[PDB]
Design a protein around this ligand. Sequence first.
Ligand SMILES: *[C@@H]1O[C@H](CO)[C@@H](O[C@@H]2O[C@H](CO)[C@@H](O)[C@H](O)[C@H]2NC(C)=O)[C@H](O)[C@H]1NC(C)=O
Ligand SMILES: *[C@@H]1O[C@H](CO)[C@@H](O[C@@H]2O[C@H](CO)[C@@H](O)[C@H](O)[C@H]2NC(C)=O)[C@H](O)[C@H]1NC(C)=O
Ligand SMILES: *[C@@H]1O[C@H](CO)[C@@H](O[C@@H]2O[C@H](CO)[C@@H](O)[C@H](O)[C@H]2NC(C)=O)[C@H](O)[C@H]1NC(C)=O
Ligand SMILES: *[C@@H]1O[C@H](CO)[C@@H](O[C@@H]2O[C@H](CO)[C@@H](O)[C@H](O)[C@H]2NC(C)=O)[C@H](O)[C@H]1NC(C)=O
Ligand SMILES: *[C@@H]1O[C@H](CO)[C@@H](O[C@@H]2O[C@H](CO)[C@@H](O)[C@H](O)[C@H]2NC(C)=O)[C@H](O)[C@H]1NC(C)=O
Ligand SMILES: *[C@@H]1O[C@H](CO)[C@@H](O)[C@H](O)[C@H]1NC(C)=O
Ligand SMILES: *[C@@H]1O[C@H](CO)[C@@H](O)[C@H](O)[C@H]1NC(C)=O
Ligand SMILES: *[C@@H]1O[C@H](CO)[C@@H](O)[C@H](O)[C@H]1NC(C)=O
Ligand SMILES: *[C@@H]1O[C@H](CO)[C@@H](O)[C@H](O)[C@H]1NC(C)=O
Ligand SMILES: *[C@@H]1O[C@H](CO)[C@@H](O)[C@H](O)[C@H]1NC(C)=O
Ligand SMILES: *[C@@H]1O[C@H](CO)[C@@H](O)[C@H](O)[C@H]1NC(C)=O
Ligand SMILES: *[C@@H]1O[C@H](CO)[C@@H](O)[C@H](O)[C@H]1NC(C)=O
Ligand SMILES: *[C@@H]1O[C@H](CO)[C@@H](O)[C@H](O)[C@H]1NC(C)=O
Ligand SMILES: *[C@@H]1O[C@H](CO)[C@@H](O)[C@H](O)[C@H]1NC(C)=O
Ligand SMILES: *[C@@H]1O[C@H](CO)[C@@H](O)[C@H](O)[C@H]1NC(C)=O
Ligand SMILES: *[C@@H]1O[C@H](CO)[C@@H](O)[C@H](O)[C@H]1NC(C)=O
Ligand SMILES: [Zn+2]
Ligand SMILES: [Zn+2]
Lengths: 848, 860
Amino acid sequence: LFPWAQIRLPTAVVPLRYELSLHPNLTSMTFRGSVTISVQALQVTWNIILHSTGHNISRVTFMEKQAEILEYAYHGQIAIVAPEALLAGHNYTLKIEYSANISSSYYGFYGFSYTDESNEKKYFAATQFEPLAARSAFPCFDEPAFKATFIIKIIRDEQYTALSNMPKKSSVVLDDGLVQDEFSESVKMSTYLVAFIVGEMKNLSQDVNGTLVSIYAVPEKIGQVHYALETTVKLLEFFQNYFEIQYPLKKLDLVAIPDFEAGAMENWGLLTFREETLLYDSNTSSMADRKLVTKIIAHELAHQWFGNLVTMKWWNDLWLNEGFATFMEYFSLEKIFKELSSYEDFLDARFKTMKKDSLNSSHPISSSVQSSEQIEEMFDSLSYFKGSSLLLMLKTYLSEDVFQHAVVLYLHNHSYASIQSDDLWDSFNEVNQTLDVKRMMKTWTLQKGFPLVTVQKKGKELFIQQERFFLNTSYLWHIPLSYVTENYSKYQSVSLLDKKSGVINLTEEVLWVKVNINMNGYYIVHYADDDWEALIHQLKINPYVLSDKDRANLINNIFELAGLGKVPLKRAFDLINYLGNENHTAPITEALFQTDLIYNLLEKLGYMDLASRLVTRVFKLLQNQIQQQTWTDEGTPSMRELRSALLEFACTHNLGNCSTTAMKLFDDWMASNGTQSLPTDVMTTVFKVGAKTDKGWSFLLGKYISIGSEAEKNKILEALASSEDVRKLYWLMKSSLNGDNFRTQKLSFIIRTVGRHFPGHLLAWDFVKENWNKLVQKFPLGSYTIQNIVAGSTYLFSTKTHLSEVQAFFENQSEATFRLRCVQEALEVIQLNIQWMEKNLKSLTWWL
Amino acid sequence: KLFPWAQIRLPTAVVPLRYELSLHPNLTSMTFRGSVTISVQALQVTWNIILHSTGHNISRVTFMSAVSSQEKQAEILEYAYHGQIAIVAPEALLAGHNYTLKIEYSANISSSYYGFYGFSYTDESNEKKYFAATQFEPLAARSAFPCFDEPAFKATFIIKIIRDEQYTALSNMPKKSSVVLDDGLVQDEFSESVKMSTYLVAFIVGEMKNLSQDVNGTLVSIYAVPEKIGQVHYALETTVKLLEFFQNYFEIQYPLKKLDLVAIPDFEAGAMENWGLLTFREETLLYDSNTSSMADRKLVTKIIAHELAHQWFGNLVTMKWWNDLWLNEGFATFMEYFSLEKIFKELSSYEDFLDARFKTMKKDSLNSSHPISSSVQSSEQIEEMFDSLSYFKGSSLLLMLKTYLSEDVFQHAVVLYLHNHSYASIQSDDLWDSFNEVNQTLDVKRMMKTWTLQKGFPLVTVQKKGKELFIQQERFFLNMSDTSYLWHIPLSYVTEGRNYSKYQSVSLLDKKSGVINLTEEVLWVKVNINMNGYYIVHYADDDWEALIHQLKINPYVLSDKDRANLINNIFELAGLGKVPLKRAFDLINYLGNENHTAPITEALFQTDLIYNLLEKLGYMDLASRLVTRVFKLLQNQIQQQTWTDEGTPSMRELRSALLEFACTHNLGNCSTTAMKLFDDWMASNGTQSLPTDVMTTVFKVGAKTDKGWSFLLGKYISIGSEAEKNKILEALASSEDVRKLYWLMKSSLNGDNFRTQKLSFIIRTVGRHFPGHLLAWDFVKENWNKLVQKFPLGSYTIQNIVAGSTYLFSTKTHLSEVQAFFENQSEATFRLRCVQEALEVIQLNIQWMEKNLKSLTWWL
Ligand SMILES: *[C@@H]1O[C@H](CO)[C@@H](O[C@@H]2O[C@H](CO)[C@@H](O)[C@H](O)[C@H]2NC(C)=O)[C@H](O)[C@H]1NC(C)=O
Ligand SMILES: *[C@@H]1O[C@H](CO)[C@@H](O[C@@H]2O[C@H](CO)[C@@H](O)[C@H](O)[C@H]2NC(C)=O)[C@H](O)[C@H]1NC(C)=O
Ligand SMILES: *[C@@H]1O[C@H](CO)[C@@H](O[C@@H]2O[C@H](CO)[C@@H](O)[C@H](O)[C@H]2NC(C)=O)[C@H](O)[C@H]1NC(C)=O
Ligand SMILES: *[C@@H]1O[C@H](CO)[C@@H](O[C@@H]2O[C@H](CO)[C@@H](O)[C@H](O)[C@H]2NC(C)=O)[C@H](O)[C@H]1NC(C)=O
Ligand SMILES: *[C@@H]1O[C@H](CO)[C@@H](O[C@@H]2O[C@H](CO)[C@@H](O)[C@H](O)[C@H]2NC(C)=O)[C@H](O)[C@H]1NC(C)=O
Ligand SMILES: *[C@@H]1O[C@H](CO)[C@@H](O)[C@H](O)[C@H]1NC(C)=O
Ligand SMILES: *[C@@H]1O[C@H](CO)[C@@H](O)[C@H](O)[C@H]1NC(C)=O
Ligand SMILES: *[C@@H]1O[C@H](CO)[C@@H](O)[C@H](O)[C@H]1NC(C)=O
Ligand SMILES: *[C@@H]1O[C@H](CO)[C@@H](O)[C@H](O)[C@H]1NC(C)=O
Ligand SMILES: *[C@@H]1O[C@H](CO)[C@@H](O)[C@H](O)[C@H]1NC(C)=O
Ligand SMILES: *[C@@H]1O[C@H](CO)[C@@H](O)[C@H](O)[C@H]1NC(C)=O
Ligand SMILES: *[C@@H]1O[C@H](CO)[C@@H](O)[C@H](O)[C@H]1NC(C)=O
Ligand SMILES: *[C@@H]1O[C@H](CO)[C@@H](O)[C@H](O)[C@H]1NC(C)=O
Ligand SMILES: *[C@@H]1O[C@H](CO)[C@@H](O)[C@H](O)[C@H]1NC(C)=O
Ligand SMILES: *[C@@H]1O[C@H](CO)[C@@H](O)[C@H](O)[C@H]1NC(C)=O
Ligand SMILES: *[C@@H]1O[C@H](CO)[C@@H](O)[C@H](O)[C@H]1NC(C)=O
Ligand SMILES: [Zn+2]
Ligand SMILES: [Zn+2]
């Protein structure tokens, strides 16, 4: 029987080089493998323990002597019983011939089908091994810490272009007709980043510093790829220069996989992407589409250094490389594509991370992983964005040049190595001398949530106090504290608060103070009574004495504290009274977000008139801006992003000029059979307005089912779901669940849109209750999809009756179903809504 | 101090003979000063007179005897729990002797509309006017005056009331003496009454006008607010007609010299049968031959018949205890339909009786049903008897007894029962004893107790084998087991044999199994003629098919009552699972040749229940498939309908049904034809004639637009026609704008633009259709405490709200949710009759879906 019994593999045997040959028939979903694993023992062992799942092994041989396999499916491991005691430092070669099936679950070595522009059934195969799927494709030591070289050999038919990490060495025609493609030996790399593609593609290539960058897409979609290649070159030159370590490989391939459930990964030389995420069109694709494609290439590019070159010893440190890439996603962009204004997106991404972090349901970023399912739990965007946030707090604290130095030093000292997060902190610790220890970053990582810094200005000294930001414990953080002050003197400095209480002596007496410049520090600031009123006043006099980043932080910070009671809700609306003099998109959108949250929460309770007073108040503040808005695309990215916001708010709440302009624009587009171009920044608005009439709805539906453009399709879906006809709404969720007119993938987005407004509110949660089993069958538990379905449907419930109902439903399923992340998070949200209403509903009547 | 009476019921020892009540009510202050002079007699020996009194502040209590002018002071005892007051007598009450008890008191005129209640209303001259009336049934008389508040304790009443010169004061008996007092007030005195029950005493102090007609000796009169005395012509005309019928049929002339009917100017006003002072809510008596519809004409005719039949059945022959309340209430409900077929044959009210009976049969076949005759002990148990179910089942038992025996034999036993027990208190069994004088004792009415004492009704399975008709009997119970369940079933049967030889008869299944010897072989057999019998009839496969085929050949070989009974039965059995749903739709495939209203509305009812159930679940193609199939049959009947008020009441009702269905579903013309009518009515600023039959159909069509909805909302708050106001409300609640629908419910609960009384009708209308199905149930859950504050726990309203919002749920997820909500309220509330029944209903729906939902795809 099997000898080793543990999740992780023994440290005795170590892989050096991998010789993998695969013959996959794409029409059928089978593949014949041949793995020659060249290892070296370090400890005296009689057996080799490594991973293997869906494999029917023909002959297993140790080297020439045929060995034997032992099985352990619980850990997904296999054992080879050696004829001799494997001696220390001795190289050994182990061959395994196997039979396996090409995956359908879009995981590991997967396969699918599609229809060409010529309407011909075409086959395609690809890989997605992160975190534990490499073992399904080939028997191997599937652990990141087990870096080795890879010689990959793929047998394929003529029509198909076979791809892999490294460049192709030789393509030889076999006697059966099939071509055997051989690939250059890989650099020292972990099993998970190993990739191989088999598909009928076309290319778009641009050479740089001998390294050939190419974009692989389906021949019918090789026209939209043009922007992506141009972007990749720019960012590759940026990264190679920033990190000061040249890109290792002689090729860099980015690939648009022709499926919507495609596995998008940072594969070393074979960057995978869902077809849609790279298709940019300079004439139609909006600012949302330019920023999205630009963000994705930059993310999977920063991974080539932070995740491929320098790899984590184990998954418990995944937040580091995913956090580092997400920071380079926003960093590199503000350096080379400065006009995009991608900081605004990071600022909003940060704001959301903070609300999900404030919850008792929150989890600390640095947490030890041992369980099989605990590894897939590390794949949440919360850890990635909090991780990215604390690298911004670090980068802003110590110089931009001091930060880069430690980055270059870490990548050099760890090139082709496996690390623990602390090794980046150590690389930082060499500040030219060792100033502060990295127990600071350990306060942030090791404990859940973030802090509330309480400022009190008394003359020339500002009394600072920190505490756990909780909604309702001895929590202590090491916080850098940036701050700007005002005979019109603009002074800014930084201070480290390591203790529960502190103070900052000022050079001169100042009128206003704003702690946390551009919110760069992952915290919420609460000023004392007269200090809130100081900024509130200044915002009304001249707000430009502060940045848009600084301004939107006060808007978010006042509106968060208003929920928790440290500030009354009247003060939140007293701050935003300055909006009549706001022209920069970042604060305007944060206000509109905040106000829309209060609106819907109120509306769902049925305070329809009070809720409308909230929107007539906000409209009266954004009236000039709303009136000044042009129904075009002529403007800077941030300015056309503002256009979309302002026109979506006024048209949603049917405010003066709006609806009629959109309705006129809609009727014209309809008469023209949808052939007459509409500005993209007004598209969704005009569509939403038009779907409010049976004729327009039936028209839009008919265009959604016909059109090519997925970006336009999404805008049509959002519109069709914004309708007030509950029968139309129900049918959408029904038809999407069956995959009738809409893919099951767009279902979550529908349920989220349906339940956002009064007609479909109860309907969406009813749908989640009645189709729970079908939903759980189609999307597994813990799935991103099932987590937004429960959040989308329940979030706007603000009654004890609703809380009892949500709780009762989730108990009646399973005890494992009630004790879930998304369930216990949703129930915590309804409770907080119940609380926000008891604190803040009373007053409202009298002042809105 | 120690009370001498621990029991609920008053002792038999002291019995009242005469009461002399003097009252001075100040309607502007809603307070009254009273004086009672009870002439009692002792049958047993006692030191304490135990009677009833609540809300009273007693000043002086004095006691007299036999041949003594002098009044001895006596002390009162309190016991608020049973509403009782004990009088500690100075002299021992010696059996046989008569004594006079006198009590002077102060009290408040009721805030609510129970006992001696008061209210104000506005004039046609924008002036405020005060009014007072009574509602003593069941335990309220004790709130107005200290008395022996039990229906058995019967006495004569001398009521005297001091009122302001402008108010017209009324009571049971005609006025004897009105004498102007020195202060400018009038002291009205009414002649000594007949031997009557305490809950039947009445008096009204109101500024009203009259309309009178002297039928023989009796001056019948209708009293109303001066501004609405013109609309009581039909009311009187009808009352005079029915009074000739009842007196003649009962063979006992009305004992009073006058018969007064009054339209109380309040919506909540206590509507009852007080001898000679029949009270009714204004709304229920106002009728106009032009502006009013069919239901309106029927309602006012039925409500007059009911309160009138009660003068004999309830007033002249009252029941000893509240446990026999179903006897007189079912008898008045039976005369409500009987008299109307006798006089008002044109109304075709037999159709309304059939439907009521169909709806009774459904609620009575649930496990939550309780037998009509069950021991009443407390006030809660007394109020439990005030449900229309015991009345309607009772009405159905009397129809079955009238049909089994002759119409002439039913009349003999009736006249016999009244004559013998006139001015006496009765036990339920005395009616059956009078019937047992059948020419003598040919059969026992121990048959009737098989019906009264059991819950539900029987399922009768029939099997034809040559010239032998095999009968079986079992409790019609819906799945989800005691064998004491046996009924003495009167079996009416109709057939056809050689050359259309139409034969009919009766048999009595007093055993589990039986056999009927048929004359010859028959092409078909039909059991329970005109559904006179309170039961369901199932058939063996071939016998069901024989009737199904005959309905396709010539269905008029059967009555319209028989034809609607078969549509009910097949569909009911299809629920239980005794017949596949395929058979039910095969029977109704005969409907292409159906011209009678009764079968059409019943087909529609059963079909609208499936549609609504399928629609609340996602099955919206099946739901449309069902409606297009029904439409295909009824096409001509829909197409032949003229948008008018022309024709007989029956064919008028048909038009309303056929066109209401056709617009609801939007089938061809209907909608456009209604929308044309709506626009024209809206164009004339709502000052144009809409035919009452097509009115609601027209209103609903317009209400589907923001323009229409708003025009209608404006007309609701403005106009006076409460009948038309209700037609507008149904339409406003028929809207598909979730926001408009919520606003309606929220408003009626805060009493904003719609009064709180209409909330239950709103909640039910919102909930019936997809847009507001979840919205109405959510509203009931969220606003539950205000709902239960406003309408008490156990009221008809709260049952109505619970039924309406839930009945369309057919998922286990929905069933758990409903349970959980009520379980989280209280286990005292979760154990209510209406909640248990609500969950029972969902459970039965889930079972109906699991039985018939899957095969439905393949047909319709
Ligand atoms: C184990 O195998 C590796 C295979 O690469 C051997 O490494 C090579 O050693 C030769 C000298 O003997 C060098 O010229 C190569 O450059 C080495 N290659 C690499 C990538 O290391 C290694 O010597 C073997 N060890 C034993 C114990 O035999
Ligand atoms: C998968 O196996 C099938 C075996 O049928 C191969 O199909 C042949 O494909 C060529 C084109 O490359 C056609 O011209 C032949 O007609 C096909 N053969 C038959 C018998 O239909 C296919 O090439 C195999 N693919 C791989 C990658 O091995
Ligand atoms: C697809 O990729 C190939 C390289 O793999 C590109 O081939 C080069 O093409 C240029 C001209 O465009 C020649 O000067 C080079 O000598 C070619 N190199 C090789 C290795 O063949 C090809 O251009 C790419 N396709 C497109 C449309 O850009
Ligand atoms: C109720 O009591 C009031 C107050 O004593 C009486 O009010 C009088 O009403 C008449 C009209 O009905 C007026 O002309 C008088 O001026 C009122 N007087 C006062 C002082 O308000 C009323 O009459 C009493 N009613 C009864 C039935 O007793
Ligand atoms: C019912 O209305 C009639 C209307 O006429 C009243 O009758 C009049 O009564 C007065 C005495 O109150 C007589 O002097 C008149 O001669 C009667 N009118 C006629 C035409 O005969 C009658 O009093 C009213 N009754 C009640 C109690 O309201
Ligand atoms: C491959 O698929 C077939 C079904 O098509 C299945 O029976 C077989 O077990 C699969 N192979 C492996 C190794 O699981
Ligand atoms: C495993 O592979 C061999 C290849 O020769 C095949 O014949 C055999 O059927 C496979 N085993 C199973 C259990 O499918
Ligand atoms: C701040 O001022 C206080 C005296 O008010 C003094 O104790 C402290 O050392 C000062 N710190 C700095 C850094 O100026
Ligand atoms: C917003 O207005 C201020 C006014 O001082 C100006 O400095 C700023 O440039 C304006 N922003 C834009 C985008 O025009
Ligand atoms: C234009 O309208 C026709 C129907 O009249 C439709 O078939 C066609 O697809 C529409 N045009 C385009 C480019 O889709
Ligand atoms: C009702 O009558 C009593 C006297 O019997 C009195 O004390 C009480 O205040 C009255 N109720 C109200 C509501 O005034
Ligand atoms: C009525 O009210 C109170 C008792 O609630 C009492 O003080 C008052 O004197 C009573 N009135 C008479 C006339 O007895
Ligand atoms: C009065 O008393 C006698 C016995 O003393 C009794 O028989 C008689 O019935 C009573 N009077 C009336 C009118 O009931
Ligand atoms: C019916 O006929 C049979 C003869 O077949 C006879 O014995 C029986 O008594 C009859 N029963 C009735 C109820 O007529
Ligand atoms: C109904 O049925 C037929 C026509 O199909 C006819 O003989 C009969 O008289 C009609 N009944 C009425 C009341 O019109
Ligand atoms: C419509 O008629 C009502 C009276 O029935 C009146 O109050 C209203 O003002 C009328 N409107 C117009 C515009 O005449
Ligand atoms: Zn990543
Ligand atoms: Zn009655």
